[model samples]
Structure formats: C-alpha cells, structure tokens
Target: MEDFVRQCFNPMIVELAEKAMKEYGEDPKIETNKFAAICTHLEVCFMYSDGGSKHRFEIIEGRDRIMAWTVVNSICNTTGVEKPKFLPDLYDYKENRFIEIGVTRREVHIYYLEKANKIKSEKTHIHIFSFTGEEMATKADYTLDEESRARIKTRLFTIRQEMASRSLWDSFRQSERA
Candidate 1:
C-alpha cells in the first residue's frame, strides 16, 4: 500500500481531492484519508505488463467523482451535516439511476461509476440512493482504454520521479494534521 500510495495514489489523489472539494463542496472539508478509504473499498482493475502490474488508473470523471461523493456523504453521515445544496437530486428509485437533467459532467460520470459498481457490490445500493445510467453500462464507458492508459502511465512516471526527489510525506502529513 505504501509503495502504491507514494508512487501513485498519494500524488494523484491529493490534487484530485482538492479539485473535488473546490468543485463539489467547499465547506465540511473532505479528508484524503476518506478518499483513500473509498479507493481501498472500490474495485480497481490493474493494468498489467510482462513484468507484472503497471498501474491502476480510475476514470477521473467516473470513479473519482463517485469517490468524492462517497467521501462527502461519509463525512456528512458522521458529522450529521446535511449534504450540499448545489448537487444533483437523490437517486430516482423509479428509474434506478439519477436524473441527468441539470447535472454536471462530474455527476454524470459518477452516475456511470455508481452503475458499474452496483453490479459488483450490490450491498452498496442499500446505503446509497443513486445508480448509474445504462448509457455507460459498457466497460468502454467507465474504464480507461489503451490510449488513456498510456497517458496515465506517463503522468504517473513524472509524479513518481517528482515524489522521489522530495520529502513529500513529511509535509503531506503536516498538512493533514490540520
């Protein structure tokens, strides 16, 4: 986990969480640990190579958005704070998915992820009201393809190199202390 976090998860999720908070909800801050918990909980299909595992790159708009919502909801559930006002409506039980009208790209992607995950993790549906639309039912809709996988590999390479050059963990932990 440390190897994965230092080389990949930490760098990607830090920036991702920041963007998630800024875009989704600024108040009732979502912690990185919360983000990590969802990552560990969610299933991530690893990209493989002859040498073995290459990397695991989740869809930014899909799994990442669902992760952001899960983290926010977890915090809200724990702290007893109501969810944000700006987001989309609760899942439509009639349709078995969220209403797409007025929803942003972020939410749309999450709808996809939620739909995908629900197939594998049925128990999750009991807790969460929303599900993904049938439009993204195919793996092509949620999982990154060959081209995007290569792009993410290059990005991770740079992130790993940059992380190796700095004492990031110390500073990273310090920031989390607040």
Candidate 2:
C-alpha cells in the first residue's frame, strides 16, 4: 500500500495540481495550497480505510478560492452523513464543464473552464480516482450480472489500451531497464 501511494497516486495528484494551476495562470506554488493538501489527506484516508495507520499524514483544509472552496465546503459540511455527489463542475473556474473517461468505478475526471468571454479558448483541470474498494467490487459485481459480460470486458480492454497508449506501461518498462 505504501508503494502504491508513493509510486502511483502521489505523483499523479501532484501532476494534476500543477496542470490545474498552469491552466488558471496561477502560481505553481498553488500545489502547496489546500486543494493539493486535501488530495494528500484523501490518500491517507484511503490508507486508513484499508485498516492501515491513521498517522500517515495530517489532514488539511481545502482551498479558499471560489471553485475549490465551494467543493471543499460541500464535502466537509456533509461529511459522515451522506456521500456528496462527485461534482467536477465545482472545480471549474469559469464555465463549468467536465468529462469522465475510463471504466469501472475508477475514472479520470477532467474539468474545463473556458477563458471568460473568449472564443475558442479553453483549459483543463484533471482529477483521477481509483475509487473506494467497495466501489470497485460493486463495479465488478454489476459486470458479472450481465448476461454476456461483453460490455464489461470491452470497457476493461479499452481502459488497458488507454493506459498503454498513455505510455505508462512503456515508461515503467524503461524505468526498469534503467
């Protein structure tokens, strides 16, 4: 689990935060802001949920910016009672739009906010989630209930292909060779 958090999740979150800041014309130091900190906190939360140490990392507040703060408050205010809807639009700075790609409960969510009042201008904010373990199992269980399981198989195949097309597998191989 430590290896997964360190090698897979942390870098991905950091990269996403960096890209988001770049798209917003904000300082890359925004990575040090509360949103990134909350992502790190989520990682620790996941670890704890898996019966691991709760002392992994200190939880931090989310950001104070309009979009970020709204999402953070939404999540915080509803904590422990109901699951907040995973609304990606709350992260969009200007115009709210989002796309979900990938399969199972795990997905890459991309939020896009066009430059205010500009034609043909756009930027993206990205978030990746592997989902809670129960969500993953639920996906698999639902897939198995289908008569043919073809859709499920196809989605998983597409996800693998996408991962390969991203050169993630190749990069891992190259690192191993190094």
Candidate 3:
C-alpha cells in the first residue's frame, strides 16, 4: 500500500491538481474569491458505497483550489468509487477563516471558524455547529500539516488528456519511473 501510494497515488493527485489549476486559469467565470478560501488547502469528503464495505476518504490537497470534476477524476482514477458526490471545505488565507459546504450525514452540517491564529497551527479550535447555530460537537482541533502536497512532485496534464492517459489498474501495474 505504501509503495502504491508513493508510486501511483501521489502522482495521480498531483497531476489532477495541476490540471484543475490550468483549466480554471483560462476560464473567464473563474473569480479569485472562489479560490480565496482554498489558498492554503482544499478539504474534500467522499464515500464509496460498494457492496458491504462503505468507506469514506478525506482528501486534503494543499496550496491551491480544485474543482469538483478534478476531484472526481482523482478519486475515480485511483479508487473504485465511481461518481461520488463531494463535500468540500477550505481555509481562507485572506480572511483567516474556514468554510464548509454540502457536508452532511443525517442532517446538514455547517461550520465556520471566524478567526485563525496562523496558517498551519497545531491546535486551531473549531466549533462544529448546525445550520441554526446549534453546537453539534465539542471544540475540535487537528494538526494542519503544511507538507500535504509539497512532498509530491506532480506533473501537469489537461482533463481530456488525463482521461486518455491510463485506466485505474494500468496506473498501478507499471513500475516506478522518473
């Protein structure tokens, strides 16, 4: 698993992220504010409901904004999960805050941290609240590592090219190369 992650999974993620950046750069409707909150990292939640095993994956890609379709390609190319709905969240560098959208299990969950002390903190306290300002969980803080995407030296390609590149199994079948 570790070898696969290092050789295949990491590269796939990096390529997808780069494609998202390039595609959005040329798009006229792509405003900078939409990605403002995603300046630090973009957190995405997705689930694979396949037979008896239903697994959820939290993808945290750092230093840029990514589109839903880009995420779809990443997950689909790497995971068995097909056509999964994404619940995305981001940390705003400009406002020093966090924002979550379409994240829910049984009920809709909306959370926000009005202020942030730093970009990558050991304990950034966040209150998990519902839509009506009702506290759902206790104050939660997790380690925000800055090297999430830094370790991987990703290559770039467009969405169309990515789709034509390789299949799920094909990506893993090849030996590691520079």
Query: Whose lDDT is greatest here?
Result: 1
Estimate, for each residue in 107-165, the C-alpha lDDT of model 2 and write its tens digit: 22221111112223232222222222212221222212333233334433443354466
Q: Candidate 2, which segments miss by more than 4 Å at Cα?
A: 1-9, 20-25, 52-178
The local distance difference test score of model 3 is 0.29
RMSD of each: 15.0, 17.5, 18.0
lDDT of each: 0.34, 0.32, 0.29
User: Regarding lDDT, does 2 or 3 come out ahead?
Assistant: 2
TM-scores of the candidates are 0.25, 0.21, 0.22
Please, what are the lDDT tens digits per residue for candidate 3 over residues 72-166? 45544664343323322432232232323221112222223222222233222232222122233224332122232112111111211332353
Clashing pairs in 3: none
Rank all candidate structures by their TM-score, best first, as comma-separated numbers: 1, 3, 2
- Predict model 2's lDDT versus the native: 0.32
For candidate 2, report its TM-score.
0.21
Backbone clashes in model 2, listed as residue pairs: none
